[PDB]
A paper describes a structure:
In this report, we describe the structural and functional characterization of the [name] domain of the permutotetravirus [name] (TaV), an insect virus which infects larvae of Setothosea asigna (Lepidoptera), the major defoliating pest of oil and coconut palms in Southeast Asia. The [name] core adopts the classical closed “right-hand” architecture consisting of fingers (helices α3-α13 and α15-α16; amino acids 41–303 and 375–443), palm (α14, β6-β8; 304–374 and α17-α18, β9-β10; 444–519), and thumb (α19-α24; 520–649) sub-domains, encircling the seven conserved motifs (A to G) that are required for substrate recognition and catalysis. The C-A-B permutation of the TaVpol palm, with the GDD motif (residues 350–352), located at the β6-β7 hairpin, and motif A residues D369 and D374, lying at the end of strand β8, is spatially compatible with a canonical organization of the active site. Additionally, in vitro polymerization assays show that the TaV enzyme is active in a primer-independent reaction, thus confirming the existence of a functional relationship with flaviviral RdRPs.
TaVpol-GTP and TaVpol-CTP co-crystals were also obtained in presence of MgCl2 and the corresponding structures solved to 2.3 Å and 2.25 Å resolution, respectively. In both cases, clear electron densities were observed for the triphosphate moieties interacting with electropositive residues at the rNTP tunnel. However, the corresponding nucleoside parts were disordered. In addition, these structures revealed a second nucleotide binding site in a totally unexpected region, a cavity inside the thumb subdomain, at about 30 Å from the active site. In this position, the nucleoside moieties of the bound NTPs contact residues M556, T560 and D563 from the α19 helix and to E601 from the λ6 N-terminus, whereas the triphosphate moieties remain partially exposed to the solvent, appearing mostly disordered. It should be noted that the nucleotides are bound next to a strong electropositive region, residues R564, R545 and R269, also containing an extra density peak, interpreted as a sulfate molecule derived from the crystallization solution.
Numbering used by the authors:
A (entry chain A): 10 to 672
B (entry chain B): 10 to 674
């Protein structure tokens, strides 16, 4: 009665069974389970939940108090009046949706500073399986929050009013500092629709004005309607008329960044960023994503100061060490300098011994000068038009929009008043290319620093003079106490640190794989703990209990992979979270990671940023994680339930031989 | 902000959009629509539904009257007492689920003779777009129904108690009449699990006793638990113990077939068929489906009597005519005879003129003798063991089970009494291999018929003598009036028939593509209309209006492809239905046909039975359908809404050139 094969029927059956949680629960009941090493229970279920709730309650009160503080005026910004709501229609609807972001015909926004913090689930697990005092102390220092009005304005003022230093910079110099492979550059002489369709972005991010919807929601309006209109005014050299008639098409929104913040500085520090119109960001992203994909990193070309694109897995961690060891004596041979946005790793030798410095810039975007920004854009544009000269003029026009977006877009903050940064200097954080602008500004300053070493100014190795130098000569503010050269353990033993310092937020450690040294990332337990108990997620009451339980599992898998497996205490905690995850939650069909489970939040595991788990019901063993970082002696990801496939299929193959003798 | 490309974002958006009927309806609002040829509306919505309800009401009352008829006794069967409910456990549960098919510990069933018929939607369309009197009369003749107790027992008695003639048949004769390709036989000397996982069946069919669930539900119980138990007793030559301990494992169920039945004979005719245990049918299916996949058909080998596997598309229809024309003068050269189950196409020449016969066998399964059945099994088993001798003993044992299933399975009918056919003769309809057993029995009889022509008995060309011959010499009953030779139009012009007769339920017709003849299937309007107004589905209250409207759309496509597009009137009716289908229903994401829309009901378009529409939102135009039947590659299926995709995506590409000179230097 041919309709489908039994093989196919069995598969269909199994795919449907992973969606029946009641059935999974039954079928996995006595299943053999592989248990992670885990910390012992420290208190009972109710106590863990009460301790977490007490902490959350205190943080909520701290946020509410800080949110109640008056903020300073916005008088440090230029004020431009009000913008009319865009009236452009795309078929049956306006591109600016009716009855939203509209105050009597004028574009409007409202800043959200909510009282709610992150959820208690992760913190409950922490109290359940770790030291009460340490958990409590750790959890009280940081919280995931909207921040505050006062802190928002304070930080906005700092990065829009700082006195900058114009860099001395040319194509020739940027070529030396940021070599790239021209063959990897996108053919921007291709047709524009196709180029823009190739850029990647966050589907649920704001599309900005005039759309006031997510990017995936606003994507047809942008592509089908606004983009060709923008294109027509570009090529007719008539952007002025478009700007004047439809100012919302060039308007940005200045927003408070919801983030992990130190509780004690909530009233002084909330980070601003800018959200630009989708058509502008997507157009410019054609150049910016093409360039970043073509950039060499330091470990590939030792003349390069670029670490933007560096990642830890597949030898990456060890690549850093090998590259760094080539650092020479200060004043004689080149140091090793790695820039990624506002993060830097500096190596030099004094009397033969390797030293490492990992300084912080204070609010770096405030120090990014207009000359650097224009030179970066010129560098990126010229790289493409050198390789693809027939599209030179179009992309040079795009370059001008890019500079504008990075330095001078008008923006809303709260209500209808439109603002503009008083000076071209200062980078408008969140503009496309933010990372590259930061990276370049950092490298230019540090390249000059290295030049001064060779000039014989060795006192620039010392915090006092280094800080003065970066301030007076580059307008950069290095945080006092963060210029602290440390002796490098150049060939660490098993379990030993490279140094105690962080780069890209992680320490470098050596661990054992058989008799091989494997270089891996690492953190102190307290830092894993802070991340764990402050998930970047607000309390969603639409979230089922199953979803919450599955989130804990995925986040634990994520932290382990990021290197929490290499700290006993974090390993034991993530292990307890995983072991306490129900069989049906482990094995259910999940949506994130394309059915493979939510990828780790940490962004620099792989260069393309996309880490994917092999299976949604695997757990990160030490052996498996180690193999992710080695250049390789790989292995599969171990399943939590080795027999899950057949318990779920209700079928275990028995060999039945048709060739038997019966007689 | 890297997460996914705008291109992938677009695509994801558009897959979402096709599931949002409100949005599809709005976006397709004033879209350009390509219309199929249609018959014009003949009455309003309300008028159509009213007349449809009128007919439906009359059918239900006719069905209820026929179902109230007392049925004759089942004394004609052997009675075997009652069977104990199977207690075999598969892990955490019994393979025979608790509280089902269990009367005080004995296996039980209840026959369903429900009063409801098919739904009225399609009939409403018929009334909306066609002649009132003709639609009413057509729709009253036939109804989709469970049948009756009275008709069911009457047809069961006929099928189980007929005097059969034992065929004279050897492997040599079957090799002649049923050649096959030995290299196309599955390697049955491979591991059994893999063999069984390769057979194909209907996921929602009953798995039979002891499962009492659908085959997809019962599948792990069958595969993981019962099958190896069966295997083990087979190889230990110990089936007797298994049978005696667990008799539900060999029990069948005798069922009434829900089908299209003639109203006036409802009380005398309801087809029985048998539902065997899943482990049994699956095991035997390894041989049976391997063999049917290896068989040659008539048009591949002119010695072959076999049409089992013939299909109409891709030149099939013309292959039949090409094969048929080779028929020679009766008594001097061989006829052309094609058998498919109980369906037969016969050609011979008389004074050089080609003639065609298309007779009907009455209740053929009652005439299939045990000798024929054992010869077919032996033939199929031998075919495999000659090619794969290392598994000879296992499969000969399966062959014994197969014969038992085909002739002697004990079975339930209604309640707990277990029955069995008294004589071995008579085929238990629905057993795996039913079609082949039927095909071989018929072929053996027509082969003998042909020889008698060659021996000089030319009076066997006439119904009176033919009917007598098939009765007396083969135990087969040819329906009076259906043996009527017809002059074949050997090379029909455009729009002309081959003859008016049917084979596999369809006529053969020639139509024009450009200026070439293409051979196609065809029916008169009335036969299409009968099929249209009697869908093979019950009234389910679970079904939404969207689902019902879509079904109409899909069934109209199905009939067009089957050949209704080649009859102007039926074409017009299907087109009217298709054109009156709402844009959102036409364009929505559909689950059937793997997303391309429910395939046609008709089972012999392709040899594998599977036909797949290219797209779910296209319609079957004359040009597209005619290309399915010619050997030329099928042209595109035309979209109902050529701009649906760009309209749904809300995006139409514009070329924007990056190489423009913006400023003269
Ligand atoms: N009705 C439900 C309930 C839970 N879930 C699962 O809940 C999980 C969400 O938790 P997660 O750890 O992966 O990620 P986030 O919720 O932290 O973003 C997904 O894997 C979903 O498959 C679901 O998909 N549908
Ligand atoms: N809620 C709904 C609505 C429509 N449908 C569609 O209704 C169609 C019914 O099949 P058919 O009668 O056209 O063959 C299927 O293609 C379904 O995808 C559905 O499945 N579910
Ligand atoms: Mg366009």
């Amino acid at each position: 009665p041919t309709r489908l094969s039994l093989e196919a029927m069995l598969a269909e059956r199994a795919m449907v069974a992973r969606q029946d949680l009641a059935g999974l629960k039954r079928k996995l009941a006595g299943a053999d389970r592989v248990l992670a090493p885990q910390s012992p229970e420290q208190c009972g279920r109710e106590s863990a939940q009460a301790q977490a709730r007490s902490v959350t309650s205190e943080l909520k009160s701290a946020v509410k108090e800080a949110q109640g503080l008056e903020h300073q005026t916005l008088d440090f910004l230029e004020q431009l009046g009000e913008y009319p709501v865009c009236g452009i229609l795309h078929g049956d609807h306006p591109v600016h949706p009716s009855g939203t972001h509209n105050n009597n015909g004028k574009v409007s926004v409202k800043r959200q500073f909510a009282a709610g913090v992150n959820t208690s689930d992760a913190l409950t697990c922490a109290f359940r399986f770790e030291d009460s005092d340490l958990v409590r102390e750790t959890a009280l220092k940081t919280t995931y929050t909207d921040g505050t009005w006062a802190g928002f304005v304070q930080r906005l003022k700092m990065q829009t009013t700082r006195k900058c230093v114009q860099e001395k910079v040319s194509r020739k110099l940027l070529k030396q500092l940021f070599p790239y492979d021209p063959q990897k550059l996108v053919d921007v002489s291709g047709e524009l629709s196709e180029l823009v369709l190739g850029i990647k972005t966050n589907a649920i991010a704001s599309a900005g004005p005039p759309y006031w919807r997510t990017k995936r929601d606003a994507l047809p309006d942008m592509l089908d309607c606004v983009l060709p209109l923008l294109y027509d005014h570009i090529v007719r050299k008539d952007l002025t008329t478009l700007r004047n008639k439809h100012p919302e098409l060039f308007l940005a929104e200045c927003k408070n960044k919801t983030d992990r913040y130190e509780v004690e500085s909530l009233g002084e520090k909330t980070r601003p960023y800018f959200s630009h119109p989708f058509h502008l960001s997507a157009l410019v992203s054609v150049l910016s994503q093409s360039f970043s994909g073509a950039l060499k990193i330091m470990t590939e070309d030792s003349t390069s100061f670029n670490a933007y694109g560096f990642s830890w897995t597949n030898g990456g961690a060890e690549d850093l060490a090998i590259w760094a060891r080539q650092a020479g004596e200060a004043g004689k041979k080149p140091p090793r300098i790695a820039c990624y946005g506002d993060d830097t790793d500096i190596y030099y030798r004094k009397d033969g011994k390797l030293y490492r410095i990992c300084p912080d810039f204070k609010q770096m975007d405030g120090s990014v000068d207009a000359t650097t920004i224009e030179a970066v854009v010129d560098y990126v544009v010229d790289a493409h038009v050198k390789q693809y000269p027939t599209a030179r003029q179009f992309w040079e026009e795009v370059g001008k929009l890019w500079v504008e977006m990075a330095t001078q877009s008008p923006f809303l903050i709260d209500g209808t008043k439109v603002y503009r940064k008083m000076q071209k200097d200062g980078l408008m954080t969140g503009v496309v290319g933010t990372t590259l602008f930061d990276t370049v500004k950092s490298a230019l300053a540090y390249n000059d620093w290295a030049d001064q070493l060779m000039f014989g100014s060795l006192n620039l190795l010392e915090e006092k003079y280094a800080i003065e130098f970066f301030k007076n000569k580059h307008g950069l503010v290095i945080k006092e106490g963060t210029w602290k050269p440390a002796l490098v353990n150049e060939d660490p033993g098993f379990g030993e640190l490279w140094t105690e310092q962080k780069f890209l937020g992680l320490q470098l450690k050596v661990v054992r794989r058989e008799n091989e040294k494997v270089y891996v990332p690492n953190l102190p337990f307290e830092d894993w703990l802070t991340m764990w108990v402050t998930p970047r997620s607000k309390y969603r009451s639409k979230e089922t209990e199953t979803m919450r339980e599955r989130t804990l599992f995925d986040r634990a898998r994520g932290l382990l992979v990021t290197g929490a497996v290499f700290d006993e205490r974090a390993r034991g905690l993530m292990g307890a979270v995983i072991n306490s995850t129900a069989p049906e939650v482990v094995c259910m069909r999940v949506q994130e990671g394309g059915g493979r489970g939510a990828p780790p939040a940490y962004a620099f595991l792989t260069r393309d940023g996309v880490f994917e788990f092999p299976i949604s019901d695997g757990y990160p063993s030490y052996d498996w994680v180690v193999s992710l970082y080695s250049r390789d002696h790989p292995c599969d990801m171990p399943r939590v339930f080795p027999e899950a496939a057949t318990l779920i299929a209700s079928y275990r193959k028995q060999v039945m031989d048709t060739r038997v003798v019966i007689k």
